[PDB]
Amino acid sequence: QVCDVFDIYAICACCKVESNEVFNNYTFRGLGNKGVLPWKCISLDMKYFRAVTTYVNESKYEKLKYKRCKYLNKETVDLQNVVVMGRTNWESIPKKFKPLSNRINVILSRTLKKEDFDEDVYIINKVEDLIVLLGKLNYYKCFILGGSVVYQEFLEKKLIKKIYFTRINSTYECDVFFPEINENEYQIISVSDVYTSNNTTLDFIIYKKTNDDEEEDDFVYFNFNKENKNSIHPNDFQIYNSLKYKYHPEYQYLNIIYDIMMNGNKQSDRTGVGVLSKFGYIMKFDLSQYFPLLTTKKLFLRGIIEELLWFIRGETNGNTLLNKNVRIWEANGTREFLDNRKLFHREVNDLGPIYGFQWRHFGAEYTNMYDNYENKGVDQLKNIINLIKNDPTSRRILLCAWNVKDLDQMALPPCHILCQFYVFDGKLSCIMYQRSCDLGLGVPFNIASYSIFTHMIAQVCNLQPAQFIHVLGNAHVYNNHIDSLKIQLNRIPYPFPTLKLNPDIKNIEDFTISDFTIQNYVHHEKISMDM
């Protein structure tokens, strides 16, 4: 209750530490090294630090000072925030910075005296002397800045109301570590957008201690005709519904799953499996700040990169993929699947004029997967690259795989109908339109595929990737993914990884598997969607 009275919070920034790894909240625990911060400088976290440790709402202080006085059984107290540091933490701060501007500076030490310090720079000897000092002060909120020992003992005494935790998604050498937060005591309630600052991704999470209104009526009136549809239970998404602010871009995906589960229409499909379906969604991912590889389950990327490279080569030979143990297309190339497609005269694993053929040879007559198609058909891929380089404000930079004439000769019609690209201020955005979206299994791979593809096109055009924009047409959750996706919805995302391409690759056809590196992929446990 003390932490509720005096509004005592922790704020920290933790990196990953040098040692299939297992990831959990304690993965981010690196506080310092050699008396200083483990990283060189992360200025977005510092901006966030100053905004949090200095923000004050005077219009809410009267209620706070009222509550503090009543608790002390006083009527008067005898506007800034309080910041509390350990002595080691106070020493490491450069002299130019000290004392922390517009903050009431409090050092918890056992070898200091106010006689070496200011009148306004307070020193306390034990933790309980802060509760005394706060009772005598006028302050909005009290922030505990560390370090490790200060965090440890404040936390063990349940003196912390909330933990403002920056997750630094890179690994450094550390010799002091944030204490493990007991998830029975504290639970994550808000997660921020993902950012890039100083060559690392980071995000901001909030741990919580566990336990004109004239126009507000008009809101109810305009809701008078509202319906909450399906046999999914609210109590199953407890963690998901308990979160207040879900700004992490992975919630763009997770919110669509929840929407389809709650409001999807029950329908059959070819496999008789049954789906919940909705029609029409857009997701947007900021490739300049992160690589949107889902973190609430484990995803593998080798297969889909090879598939992309196989596309760019113009290949339609499934064997090429199968010999690399990339089996994305195997079921679509069997004798039985082709026969059921009425492709009686198609060789096994000859998928016909699918993506690769349309990207490099749209309009050419397909014969078989071994034929030579050099200079036959429209080379869309080359054309869009040249439009991007030479006519970047063109509204006609489209790459289309839905060749209406060839659909029946394909093993199956493409789910990814087209990409359209957009260039502004030397930056490349790409929209992909998908007609059919397996949310549980297919869509997570599809976001990665076209996010990688957007990086590749941008690099060979000497542009920076900006946004990948994903338009979902028939968007469905297979009934046999529902249990698994319920598990997934209650996992809290980690800060996204980043993608690195070999910078020397300046032509779209020159990438190989080794030119792609995923960095700092922190993820929850893998999940079998069909359990």
Add this chain to the structure above:
Amino acid sequence: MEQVCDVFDIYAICACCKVESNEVFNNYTFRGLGNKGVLPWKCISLDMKYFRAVTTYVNESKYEKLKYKRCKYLNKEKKLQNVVVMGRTNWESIPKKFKPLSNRINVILSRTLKKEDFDEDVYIINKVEDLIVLLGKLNYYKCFILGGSVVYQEFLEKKLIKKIYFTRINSTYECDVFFPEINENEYQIISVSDVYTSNNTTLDFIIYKKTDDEEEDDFVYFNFNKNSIHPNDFQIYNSLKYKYHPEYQYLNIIYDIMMNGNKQSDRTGVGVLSKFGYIMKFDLSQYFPLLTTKKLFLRGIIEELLWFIRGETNGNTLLNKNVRIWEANGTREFLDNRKLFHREVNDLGPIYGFQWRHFGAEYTNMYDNYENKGVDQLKNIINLIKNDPTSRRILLCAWNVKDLDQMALPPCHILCQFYVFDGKLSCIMYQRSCDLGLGVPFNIASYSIFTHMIAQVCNLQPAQFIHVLGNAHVYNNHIDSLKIQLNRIPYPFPTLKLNPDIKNIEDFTISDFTIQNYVHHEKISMDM
């Protein structure tokens, strides 16, 4: 200097239709209150439901503040209910089985009748000032004036109304009593609802106005991290509190492009502000989304759509109907600048109609008979909807990569995808390039009509038209005109009627389409 209507929370609620009398439209278009002592229309049940929800809703936790405020003004220390006030004529028009209005404190204004003339649990008052006295003596949440016209007129005249809850019934009926003309200097629209259909009419609801705190701070922390267009230029648009009318999907995108768009050149050289990736959804079961903040005619785009369905590429066919949509793209100079030197004037090449009916056939000229050449995807999608409704492959594609350079210009409307659930048909159209000022209003109308035509010949009802915008841009020379448009308040949308006898997609003609009850602001020239 307090106001009686603010101390005692006095509101008016009403429903108005259009009245029988090349026309101008304004707010006073909706003024029909009653006829022959009863309502002008038979029964519009959705308005009844809205009427009930508003006049019975109370928030108990707010009454404490309300009681204190009224006590202050007056200089003093069962379930809470609203008060409703009716003129005597209004009271007598209500069927007996609904009198007194359930869960409300009923107050009747009369001089010719007194309490002895009433069996029911009601207050009689014989002048407006006795209402104020009564309200000072009662426990109530809010006080709603229900009419009729005489009651409205004097309460408005005396400025005793804090807000008017106003239903716009978008159809015409014979009337003999009318809502008073609202004085725009006195009352302004602050909110507008979604559009609905009920009992074969559209309607919306508009509002006139008299002219754990811990999570509060976390929001501020998470927010710790452009164009020479001016605030005062959107006073009406930004003064609105609730903008739920579906036309705001379009107006908000205009506003978004103006405030955040990227400055770019383009093929025409005009210059644009542009953004990338938008989606609008329109519920065709509830309204036809023909924009009302400016005037639009549909005869041309319907002839165009029928010309598509016939597989035609001959521009002269449209021009002979005085439909000039494609005229500039058919000229010798336009065709030559496309390198189409061997193309006859107004032969548009293998554009939408040819791709819909003959995808993959070699185009020769606009006069050829292409019967049984290429893929008839229009027939195919109709068959899939009828016979394979859960297919995720029901797509109609005009972007034929092979044929693009032979087209007068490449299509903007890349594809249509359809969706069937529970006997209702939805359509997604993806537009690669979207002239928000000129083309998008028409494009919304075209594919909304196309969705109705496909649904009907497949024995389905239309549900959603969904419009995905790719490169969405506003031309610089449209900006001043669009600033005007964004400060207009949409009217309830019209409805679209198809001749129900038409059972095959190819059998429609121009007279099988009717747009009814189009109420709209004045026409705007987007340029100059």
